[PDB]
UniProtKB/TrEMBL annotation:
Belongs to the acyl carrier protein (ACP) family. Pfam families: PP-binding. Keywords: Cytoplasm, Fatty acid biosynthesis, Fatty acid metabolism, Lipid biosynthesis, Lipid metabolism, Phosphopantetheine, Phosphoprotein. Carrier of the growing fatty acid chain in fatty acid biosynthesis. GO terms for cellular component: cytoplasm. The modification O-(pantetheine 4'-phosphoryl)serine is found at residue 40. 4'-phosphopantetheine is transferred from CoA to a specific serine of apo-ACP by AcpS. This modification is essential for activity because fatty acids are bound in thioester linkage to the sulfhydryl of the prosthetic group. It comes from Acinetobacter baumannii. NCBIfam families: PRK05350.1. Its main location: cytoplasm. It is found in: Cytoplasm. Residues 2-80 form the Carrier domain. This is Acyl carrier protein.
Length: 82
């Protein structure tokens, strides 16, 4: 079992390492599209490191339903813990 809190730390570090997105602003109350205006490069970089990190493929339907950073860590731990 993995924690969404520790998951957020890895998520924040990888997005800062790749596109230099500050992890301090990226909180669990930060809107991804509305506040950060996530594009296809931020999403694509994270999809590859998300697929590699858990070892499972992700579907695009879930990404459409994603609205906030907390939702992403919830979905990762939701489909990871089992």
């Amino acid at each position: 079992m993995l924690s969404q809190e520790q998951v957020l730390t890895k998520l924040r570090e990888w997005m800062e390492d790749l596109f230099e997105i500050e992890p301090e602003t990226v909180q669990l109350d930060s809107n991804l599209y509305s506040d950060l205006d996530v594009d296809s490069i931020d999403a694509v970089d994270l999809v590859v490191k998300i697929k590699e990190l858990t070892g499972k493929q992700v579907k695009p339907e879930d990404f459409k339903n994603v609205r906030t950073v907390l939702d992403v860590v919830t979905v990762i731990q939701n489909m990871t813990a089992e």
